Amino acid sequence: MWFEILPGLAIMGVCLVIPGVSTAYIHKFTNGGKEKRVARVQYQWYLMERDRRISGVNRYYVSKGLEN
Amino acid sequence: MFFINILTLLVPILIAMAFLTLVERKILGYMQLRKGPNIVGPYGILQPFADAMKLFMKEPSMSLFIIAPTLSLTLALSLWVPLPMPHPLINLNLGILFILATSSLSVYSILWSGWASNSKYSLFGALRAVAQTISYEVTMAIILLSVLLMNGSYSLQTLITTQEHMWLLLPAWPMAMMWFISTLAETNRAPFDLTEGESEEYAAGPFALFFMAEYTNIILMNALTTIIFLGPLYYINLPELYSTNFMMEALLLSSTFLWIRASYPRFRYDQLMHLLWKNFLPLTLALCMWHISLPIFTAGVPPYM
Amino acid sequence: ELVEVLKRGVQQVTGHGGLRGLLRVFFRANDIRIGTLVGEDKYGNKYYEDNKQFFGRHRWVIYTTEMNGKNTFWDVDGSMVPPEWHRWLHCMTDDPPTTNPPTARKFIWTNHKFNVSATPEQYVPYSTTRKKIHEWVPPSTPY
Amino acid sequence: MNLYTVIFINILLSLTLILVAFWLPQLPFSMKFFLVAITFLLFDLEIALLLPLPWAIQTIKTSTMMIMAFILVTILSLGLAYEWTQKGLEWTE
Amino acid sequence: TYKYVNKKEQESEVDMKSATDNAARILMWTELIRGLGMTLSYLFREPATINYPFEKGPLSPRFRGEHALRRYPSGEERCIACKLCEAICPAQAITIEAEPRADGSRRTTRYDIDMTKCIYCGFCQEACPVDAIVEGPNFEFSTETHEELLYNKEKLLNNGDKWEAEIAANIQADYLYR
Amino acid sequence: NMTLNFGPQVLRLVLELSGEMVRKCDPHIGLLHRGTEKLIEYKTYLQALPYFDRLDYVSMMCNEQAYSIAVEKLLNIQPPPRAQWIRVLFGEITRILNHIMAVTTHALDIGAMTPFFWMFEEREKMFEFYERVSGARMHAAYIRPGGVHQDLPLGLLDDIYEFSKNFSLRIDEVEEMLTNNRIWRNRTVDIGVVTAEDALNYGFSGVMLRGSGIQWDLRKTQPYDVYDQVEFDVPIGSRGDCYDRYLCRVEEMRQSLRIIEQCLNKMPPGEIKVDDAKVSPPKRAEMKTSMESLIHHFKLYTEGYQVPPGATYTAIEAPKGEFGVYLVSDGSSRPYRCKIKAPGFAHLAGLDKMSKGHMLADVVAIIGTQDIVFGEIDR
Amino acid sequence: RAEYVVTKLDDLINWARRSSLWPMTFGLACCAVEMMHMAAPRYDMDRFGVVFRASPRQADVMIVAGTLTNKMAPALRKVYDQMPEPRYVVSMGSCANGGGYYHYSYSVVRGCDRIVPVDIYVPGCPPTAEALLYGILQLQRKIKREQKLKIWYRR
Ligand code: SF4
Ligand code: SF4
Ligand code: SF4
């Protein structure tokens, strides 16, 4: 009966769920636990290039704090 | 990293398109009271690979012959790039306009196929389908131009933070009743699949490519609905939950398409263009004016970061 | 009222000869339904009945692996059904041989035969008659 | 670079598929159509004019944007209704 | 006693209520949704499908398929060359050539059929006064060549000596009706 | 003028087009002609029926019945009551079969393909009945001159009742999908609009008439069987469109059950084949014991039963219309001419007028209404 | 090895051309109601990965069903030439195997095996959809018993 379509429904479900979590976890692994910043404007890009310049490593996924 | 992500975005969607062909066959069979494929493998999870091997086994201007299907498929795959699930692969302001462009283009393939095939028979249907697709993409664009005024940005992330509290269907359903239909024309699905109903030149391989892109566009328009008019739950700690609810609603719409394909007859071309030009375009313009006034005789004028 | 269905499903699973038999069946004949066994031919063909299902599906059959020097685990026809059961299987009657055996007669084919399409023991046509017109058999001496 | 990568990848995948396909085995006019294409143009141009609302709305001259939008929409509808009444949407030859 | 379809019992009204219902059904698509509901209903039902090689459809003893000559319980044949099958076969399919038999009795030497012409009607088993030839139930004798279907006396005899364990019961049930 | 050909997707059409609308539609018949009326003359009156089953292949029994009735009008006899009733029964079952196939192929050629698969189960049930009675699925030799071949086994009536108990619900569940769907209403309405005078002239029959207001049914009039006994209300339409025709077909589907109910509840006992052994063969027990019955068996089955020189024109209300037979005969078993009259012929003669001014994808709906079958047409 | 895996590859590609079967249902006459009854629920052609209907240019098998006259022969040979290799054929009925009840007529092709080749035959007037399935399975086996790669690798 109608309980024979699940072996395709669940398949499509998992294979449409994989890309989202893939992207999220991958962005997070790269940028160190925090998501990938976005720049709809020049303001955020200025912030990002500033953090890049002061990272001491030339990468922006480093937030310093008050110990600088 | 990035190549890994593109693989995660391209391989699983092809897998899902295959198993979507399967699901179509099964649900149509169960609505016509029969089973559907249950033999090639357990409950029919190998028929798609069987079809692939068979097609690539079948024997048959090379320029058009190749560029048309390739173009269509590449567009259909690129359409996926800018989607949020929940954080996208490529955050693009104007993403939905990029979507509309790359969805409209395939008309070039449809048209080159005809202009190559000398068959007057072929140009007949080519012109007809091209015209219907064009005319429905018009409204497909105006609906967005009338809704997105709720979030003053053509982005696709802002949709989510917007729908945080409520959805986008309780309002704007005079549109969803359309955006859930034009999607049945650009895709040349039913009840507007006349382009495959009246037949009197696609070989095996290029046919496989055309069909791949067709069902990809199916999945993608359904995802666009699930994102726009059926806002999921964006609790930042649960991107998994977002993706999961998105999956659910996409499957629901993709089975609604099949309810339709099974139940209804097909539209006579003239009746169809009448439908559009004399029922949807006036309503569409008036509703766009309505949603233009709403943020003026109400404080609800949204921001632009 | 779903655990009844679930228990039905699990006893359906286990009814077969464990995982191995379940796999043999669920990969040869794509069914798992459990039902009574009433008869068993001499080749291995195991028949089954379940009179709570609808029509045409209340009887069924599990064929034999090897039949007359042949490997029929995958290869499976519908002509491998011997007649004295074929009749019932096709819904012509309601009493199997164990309670309605046939007439014990000779000159009947004991070892049934699967279909003979292109095998080297297939069928061909010919004439079953002698020569209508005889002829002259000349001598073997010169004059 | 990212979109370049993605697009090259998609194109190369499609071409691998088609190369597999190729290796593994071894008229009068209808004025109505032109009129419809023309309607499509004269609407896409309206679309180009009309898209910028999500940024024209956050300005201060609401009394101007509201008006100009209504104007465009209503005059376009007038042209549409005239085309209809003069039988550009009938298809019977 | 005629009738009238597609016609109202009288002229309709212009009630705002009737116009309202009309407008609703024209906008929100009530009837289309009802059709979708019906399809859902049939989706949630049992399918009439069956596995052919492991389940075979129903029939009745009166089937008409593969052919079969027959025998008495004493081994002897039943055909005596009465030729009714030849003179009644609508297709002229059958071909017979009879002769004596060294034991003095009467019998055949050629009883050939072309199952490409045989329309599977029943006239031969109706005419045969001795029930010799009986169009049988076997419908699985599809082949790969057009010469496994020009059956002859020996193939028919084999089919009889094979299926006689079923035709006996079939006829024992059916004959009274005829 | 873009004149083109059109085939399957037998139906070879040549469309003289103008843009998108039509100007002319010339069919090209003959793709299914064989030699029925050139073979019969070389045969008897009892190895001809198969031809009349193969003709209008859907029903087959409202055709065997026509042949039987012609032969009987020639032989100046009648069959018995049980035979007449059984024959009415199967006539109605065939009305149902043909209406189903017309409806569903209409909806299929349009694109709606679910009711096809739905009703084909019930069609399989009817075929189970044909099997229980005749022996084969479709092309049964059951109905024969001088009555019928065999009586009814002892497990049929109950099944027929149990099937009629549900066919109505299935019909309603298909109506729910179609008879109100605006899409079907727009595919069919104002199509194939016809006027009574031109229908009569062109020679239309049956539904193509009574969907245009006319009152003509060869069962109420020219009653060939017991149809004068039972009640069955005839449907008609006022407009004359494919919608009205569809609705006529469905209403006939229903009145056919209104008939079957009474056929069942009044079927009498008795015989099947008239006991005139010079015409219909006798039972086998007598064929074997007695002698004269054996002689008559022999003669019937080598030299068909002689027929006196006459000529007739019968008629039936087959699913479509005036299935007619002009059967000429010399004083011999081998007849001299058997002209069939199948309505598809005139339906095509009127297609070129029903398709003047309508678009390209309405020819299909026209043909669906006409229920075109080509076996009956080519002859 | 080489020959072993070559045989296995041929068996797999035969698996494909055996499951993904698409017919052109060239049904002229009353051997057609039975194709339709077969694609109907109770036997469900599709179950074996065999679609109800489909155009030639993408089809693999071709089911002839009905009298094959001298006006619809040309079209048939045209279709069988247009179709793409491989192209399997299935004759379904007396009329199309030996001209059936119309053998001795003047406007019949006394056998579709004259116009076109054949890989399977089926008797009937009509047949039974069950016998038709049996013919199609005989066809699946006539496929599974092919050794193209072996004959090439030993050409
Ligand atoms: S069944 Fe009919 S057609 Fe076939 S051999 Fe017998 S008499 Fe001839
Ligand atoms: S009717 Fe019977 S006995 Fe007479 S020739 Fe034919 S098979 Fe022989
Ligand atoms: S063999 Fe019989 S059923 Fe088949 S097409 Fe010919 S007449 Fe019709």
PDB file of C-alpha atoms and ligand atoms in Angstrom, chain E residues 69 78-86 88 94 96 108 111 123-125 127-133, ligand 2:
ATOM      1  CA  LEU E  69      -5.533 -34.125 -28.795  1.00  0.00           C
ATOM      2  CA  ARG E  78      -9.705 -40.560 -30.240  1.00  0.00           C
ATOM      3  CA  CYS E  79      -9.399 -38.945 -33.670  1.00  0.00           C
ATOM      4  CA  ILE E  80     -10.842 -41.037 -36.483  1.00  0.00           C
ATOM      5  CA  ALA E  81     -10.628 -38.488 -39.287  1.00  0.00           C
ATOM      6  CA  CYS E  82     -14.204 -37.269 -39.280  1.00  0.00           C
ATOM      7  CA  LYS E  83     -12.900 -33.948 -40.653  1.00  0.00           C
ATOM      8  CA  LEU E  84     -15.581 -31.843 -38.961  1.00  0.00           C
ATOM      9  CA  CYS E  85     -12.824 -29.714 -37.466  1.00  0.00           C
ATOM     10  CA  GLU E  86     -11.508 -29.056 -40.970  1.00  0.00           C
ATOM     11  CA  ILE E  88     -15.927 -25.997 -39.652  1.00  0.00           C
ATOM     12  CA  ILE E  94      -6.406 -27.367 -39.994  1.00  0.00           C
ATOM     13  CA  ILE E  96      -5.739 -33.436 -42.403  1.00  0.00           C
ATOM     14  CA  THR E 108      -4.760 -40.260 -39.275  1.00  0.00           C
ATOM     15  CA  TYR E 111      -3.313 -33.555 -38.343  1.00  0.00           C
ATOM     16  CA  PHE E 123     -15.875 -24.971 -32.947  1.00  0.00           C
ATOM     17  CA  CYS E 124     -13.525 -27.946 -33.238  1.00  0.00           C
ATOM     18  CA  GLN E 125     -14.137 -29.110 -29.671  1.00  0.00           C
ATOM     19  CA  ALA E 127     -17.944 -30.666 -33.389  1.00  0.00           C
ATOM     20  CA  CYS E 128     -15.565 -33.486 -32.453  1.00  0.00           C
ATOM     21  CA  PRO E 129     -18.160 -36.099 -31.421  1.00  0.00           C
ATOM     22  CA  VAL E 130     -15.537 -37.944 -29.362  1.00  0.00           C
ATOM     23  CA  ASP E 131     -14.112 -34.944 -27.462  1.00  0.00           C
ATOM     24  CA  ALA E 132     -10.707 -35.800 -28.927  1.00  0.00           C
ATOM     25  CA  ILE E 133      -9.465 -32.280 -29.585  1.00  0.00           C
TER      26      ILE E 133
HETATM   27  S1  SF4 H   2     -13.421 -33.491 -35.239  1.00  0.00           S
HETATM   28 FE1  SF4 H   2     -12.149 -34.719 -33.797  1.00  0.00          FE
HETATM   29  S2  SF4 H   2     -12.318 -36.864 -34.560  1.00  0.00           S
HETATM   30 FE2  SF4 H   2     -13.042 -35.507 -36.247  1.00  0.00          FE
HETATM   31  S3  SF4 H   2     -11.184 -35.159 -37.534  1.00  0.00           S
HETATM   32 FE3  SF4 H   2     -11.284 -33.424 -36.049  1.00  0.00          FE
HETATM   33  S4  SF4 H   2      -9.996 -34.106 -34.285  1.00  0.00           S
HETATM   34 FE4  SF4 H   2     -10.445 -35.972 -35.529  1.00  0.00          FE
END
